[model samples]
Target: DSNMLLNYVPVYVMLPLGVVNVDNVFEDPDGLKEQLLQLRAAGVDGVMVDVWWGIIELKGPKQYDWRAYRSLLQLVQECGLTLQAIMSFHQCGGNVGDIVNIPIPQWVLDIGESNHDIFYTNRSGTRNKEYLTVGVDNEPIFHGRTAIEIYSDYMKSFRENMSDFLESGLIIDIEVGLGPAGELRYPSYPQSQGWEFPGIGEFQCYDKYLKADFKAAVARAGHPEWELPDDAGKYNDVPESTGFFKSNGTYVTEKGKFFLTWYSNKLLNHGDQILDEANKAFLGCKVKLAIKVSGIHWWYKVENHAAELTAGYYNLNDRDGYRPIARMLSRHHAILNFACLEMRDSEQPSDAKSGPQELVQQVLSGGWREDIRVAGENALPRYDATAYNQIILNARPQGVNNNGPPKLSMFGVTYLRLSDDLLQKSNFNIFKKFVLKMHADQDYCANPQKYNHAITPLKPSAPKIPIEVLLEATKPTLPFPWLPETDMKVDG
Candidate 1:
């Protein structure tokens, strides 16, 4: 069971009091201190904070200014709140929630240009003008420099300087931002300033690097001539499936399962590689990796929530979405689905449930069977006690009483702020203080499992791969290489 997730719950805290300027701590210590006091007063066990890359490495590599972060941590320590440090790796300029924009160091951008456009490209062959992710952009050959190397140096220094904080056991978790907005999915936002086909149209990983990688992936699947789309999109709008190739296995029962499996593998491999890098930073700190998960199965033709005609990521579903992410979390001893459970939102539905909600259902059903902790934090334009309940319904285990506390250890909201529209002091008093406490009481944590169900783990399920893979793998006798992209003959 997810011990950490079930035991304690924390509230996410950004630059409190609308303090975007990292340097404000020196000027207004009282205000910052008051913010923590308020969080504590509202019955928060701890606080989750992001350590901005822009502010820390403002000037260039090897040059850091963690003064503001120090002040913030000091205040957190003073207020006696536990900490889940966020190791933010990507640029934070473009956002949906009206949060502050924090760009990467200018020198890093210059370095990207000096070698190649490391930023993510859209299907239309345009580099993301806003931010760069370490997932693919951290490739070598940038004047012999790498993003992981720089990030590693920063984290090492952080651990050394905050050694005392470590001893206090306040830093319980280290949530690593694996990609844009701290999610594991590819950067798929439609535009820099707006939110459209996010996680959908943003799968254009056809830069010279990924393009080569895709061709290689095709060959490995025994389909050499299978060319990627002209606009740098291969299977963006391939719809979705009930269960394609299911596991990471190669055998397939259907024709298209091969393509889906081959394509999905590329995403999984890159995501896993980057996550492995982030895990290196906290080797001795004894912190678990917190992965932010993305739920983009809404655009699948099967669900048909909302999708663009072309250059969309409808195919990035249960196969590429859950398998890779779940495997990575298990392999790295990490936890996830931070913001994927947006509520029982009708905005994007699939078979009577949100894609992410269903994905969570499938993952938990798979019997991940790991010694890691899994927890979730809410995200959206707004949140509420009523809305939060929807998330618990989606992620919590079966047999738990809906009216009372959770029965399983997997059901826990690590930190919660009722609503984005409700981040004010008055709202805190009403919801954060009053409503939050009341809700916790209703959780399984209250009354020590008095209203809980039998603590039973789920039965193990299939790999959840593509449909084609399953069909191909089960064939008794078949011709070899019968798919397109290959030169083979089928007997009549």
Candidate 2:
């Protein structure tokens, strides 16, 4: 009989540090560099920082100032750490856990001053300027440049400005912002707009552009009378309070199905268009392109999956929603960076029917099913062993002791924020331990740099993989076959 072997993928641990302030300057380079050194010593592989559009392109269209980020990246490189830069095309202050106010470019807002529909509008006609509306994705409203063109130009400028880091492989990943908060979904819930957690957020298709598009789609579907959901409750209302999301409500009706399909398709199409542009923008660059998908786990146990539906996921128990999104990412060779990895279902409000654990499983498995690299991040700041264990659980669902065939695991995990509290002695200790475990090597506690490169352990004819047999598979997917004990001679 052929000998069967088990292998485990190594997970890199990253920290998201706020490098730039509201005024678009590097935040205390001396202090940040000190912390970056501490993180490098503590086994953090790299840092993920948002390249804010509000900061870089604050002046006007086609004008990008890479001075602040150039300094930040140079400092990170000097500190002996890798980087994952996010093209944060969205604003920062309106969403959850956002303490600073970083709006989009003022010139874009000046244009919106005359045309208020450039931002997302809800059923109540409240405009959300935190991000440009998906409705304006194609409309030439922003001084003749479409939203997609604006985003593409921004990324192209970044590629040209940061070509040195990209060519040197110092910047490993580039996360493209598809919507508000850089997630590929609608801005359904915004804390700045009076929407709270567990509330079934209102649909954001009331803008003239989106409404016109929706009307066209309805007519094409042979139902010109059908319009946007007027019965879908307010922004702060619960699912039970809404006729569209209540038990046996319109969400399951044939009409609701058509509406959701169209709405979700709109989001999918947006992702596709932006990612296609991103792919072209970063062509031949030695960096992985990623797109973040928000983990809307609340109301997930409900039949309607109201929270996710409002967020443009349209996931139900019977219908797999994330599969389509994962497949789209695979089409562009993009990594799926999901959030809420540190949250557990048991820790959630049972009355609210939240299921972060199950949601993570579905999302990670969906990416694995498409054979795309999957990464994770926490939705909120957490500094406890329980939260770290939850992240480890999701990263390696079968745990680090499984003796079966290798399964797909997280490519990396990003800690939410790097603050003074995280640098405290006790908290830093916990974080170091978490990073040690993520690297899956005890020696990493002493020598972190030895495992800095993108590596995964592969064993042959053994029950457990050892750290010595680290494989250098830096491509999007593993080169080895999934079969057990098949010879190590394989091509992508």
Candidate 3:
């Protein structure tokens, strides 16, 4: 029997801080307290802090200072908000003579020695070596631990010290590092074994570990190791084409097709295991941390293609991007499938943003099963209504995908809009109304066609709203406040 899948609703709250350099909370004690107070006042149910592991353990091994962290967390709890830690090994070291820029301690470095060979490297040649040390040369070496292992350890540590934060009945979501400095390098490379890291080497299908695994699989299939080709490239020249392999004679098996599916599934399985272990580690702590994990950014593409490899089979032009992975991961109890919609002027980040009325009609019609949350950074306020409408339409209790729908959740509406007008507009009210309507119509599961219209089509005059609104009784309570604020902003 085919398993039915359900969409889980997710609520998102943006803490005051932006991604880089800018601290959401003030550095001073009083100011930080004020920031926490304002965040709670803003009605945010949860808060996110980018906790740099390197920063906390700068002085030495096993030595962590939580003086500031304790105060901040205490304030957050006092304000009735949950805390989420965006775990990072990078981005905390301060200038010279400052305790901020301190590196990971030596003990942790020693622990990572086993998985050091898998560390990723950046374009600037800095390897993602996990070590516990402040000095550049003494940076913690993440050798023995796999990415899964490292994450599990981090979660365990959080469970031990911050179990109270989790047990406070707050939904704690985990956002894994998107990429090391925003690049698609192996998690362990460049440092452990020079430029030829084991993980990358295995990716190339030349590493000893892969060879053994492949041989073992082949043996299980009743094939001899001698019959298998030693070089994976013996089958294809292009790196992307390496998915194809010569099995026998003139006939070539498209191993690329199988590898793409199998490897992705394997990665998902690994992710599941990591989450399971982390959840177990927090067991004795008695904190019920609702494990919500997002897959790394690379797995969120609408197309399976990586940006660095634009002209390959993995390209968006080929496979339906990373949607399958998203689908699979969301299946796990611990995972919440999320895709980062990189703000773009030309395209609607997701297909849900094509037409407003059509989007509403689709929701009323009821085809989509899962609740999807569209997150955008610096997106135009005009797009919010449509996006929010789509989210509401999709988030129904019985709005199952191929399968039956899951339970209704608190639908989340988040965007980086700082303007007052954008938040107060009647359209925003309409969007909210639609959300409530959908919630009211949880059992209205009808089959609707997929929405595929082009969004924001070119025109000489101003763009029209996709839906027609009656202006007979309703007065224009306010000019589009979003107009002025959204127009002048150069970067969003």
Candidate 4:
């Protein structure tokens, strides 16, 4: 049957055409509506939008302005498309291919001004403001509320304001923002910090709060004298030039193992905490929860996998770092969203030992092994046929069968962005062909306008509580007691 020839990977296009202004207005609503119509007609399954915290809660703590997103959601529904709303808790810009700048809430920045430790810091004490440091996740330093509480509150506000969409099944997926650039990792290689491609990014645990936690963990592990690595190199340093990451370096030693385990655990713990809150916030909601894991494919072929380690992955040549991450997501039943699906292994610089192909395989395997749904997105923008083939290859390495059903396909694939260039006649033709391929129809001349695929509703494993009850049960009891302080000298 023709239905058996179809693939299950729903292609989603990232929206907000460009960065929304700080004033909380989506520029040119009429123009955006036209784009949405085009995407839907092109057979795209849905649109993914970033519900930026900076814009939503910009006015003050707990004060949300949902005017822009409310209208955007309306427009999306009007276009006959489903939606995937990303609770982007991180800032825009400074990361790879980031062309716009939308920072975290200004109020949060004001807090960081007095206490720089609220932001992740490199060994040199450079603060990264892309996202709030996980070190302060549990610390009630943000106006007597912990970082997790802030994120949970933001999600709650989103649910309350967007109740109409949530109830109508218009919004199918909700990707919770865990860290920098809305991916579950540190800002280890932030370009704003002068970091460049192929460079081994520095560890981001030098912030005072994280350091204190590290010291405590060391003591608990029967090594009270142990401290954070002092020998890790700068952001731009390569593995060969760094004492800690060089051949047979400390990263392979027992101390290095301990540090790596502790560091990665902190990241995992942060995700667990936030996801637990996320589950509570959207308890009875129809949406599926998802989290993004950065594709740090550079340095993967090396013994140490320095860049991945510095990014809090803890993956080495001998270790399966992502398996634990997948295991964690299993508890929350969240979809593991990964990026870099469009990159080929050979396309990257061989000198850097980059392996996007293998990296995508390993990450997808982790999710599959854990029995959870896995999704993907492109790390950078690309319009070439080669990139589209790479995306298809990763989505289903075994390819599709015309005579029978397709097996082991990705949950979905989200296009990096929606831009004017993407909608131009030439590029749109190429993209339309890509969409048809994603549909996996055997007929080459099949019309996209006749495609009738719709987003399937998720079946909850537990009895879903009513939204009002879910909100009330998850409401944080106020009167948080202020916690007192504690930074680094550097790696030796």
RMSD of each: 11.4, 9.0, 15.9, 10.8
TM-score of candidate 2 versus the correct structure, residues matched by position: 0.88
Flag the better candidate by lDDT, 1 or 3: 1
Q: Encode model 2's per-residue lDDT on 322-400: one tens digit a residue.
A: 7678777766778899999888888888767898877887888778877888888988889898787777667666544
lDDT of 3 by residue, 1-492 (tens): 111212323223344332222222236555545544543443333555555555555444445554455566677677666655555544332211122332444445555455332333232234344321111111234444444455556656755676566565442454433223211122322222343201112132222333345456556655534222323332113223333222331113344343333333333344345445544565443222222222122212323222212111122233332333223323332223232222222243342222222222222221112223222122223435444433443333234343444343223333323233434556445433432333232221211111111112111212221111211111212111111111111112
Candidate 2 clashes between residue pairs 3 or more apart in a chain or in different chains: none
**Native-vs-model 1 lDDT?**
0.49
Candidate 1 versus truth, CA RMSD in Å, comes to 11.4
lDDT (0-100) at residue 335 of candidate 3?
Answer: 29
**Cα deviation in Å at residue 112, candidate 2?**
1.0
**Residue 171's lDDT in candidate 4:** 87
lDDT of 4: 0.80
Q: Residues 64-106, candidate 1, lDDT per residue (tens digit)?
A: 8767777767878898776777777666656555355666677
User: Better model by TM-score, 1 or 2?
Assistant: 2
Q: After superposition, how far is residue 281 of candidate 2 from its true place, in Å?
A: 1.1
Clashes of 2: 0
User: What TM-score against the true fold does each predicted structure earn?
Assistant: 0.72, 0.88, 0.49, 0.89
Top-scoring candidate (lDDT): 4
The CA lDDT at 17 in model 2 is 33
Q: What are the per-model numbers of colliding residue pairs?
A: 26, 0, 41, 2
Residue runs of model 2 more than 4 Å from their true location after superposition: 1-18, 401-405, 442-492
